Design a protein around this ligand. Structure first.
Ligand SMILES: [Co+2]
Length: 9
């Protein structure tokens, strides 16, 4: 989840 959020943003 952490990296999903980072990439999305
Ligand atoms: Co990151």
């Amino acid at each position: 989840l952490a990296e999903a959020l980072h990439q999305a943003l």
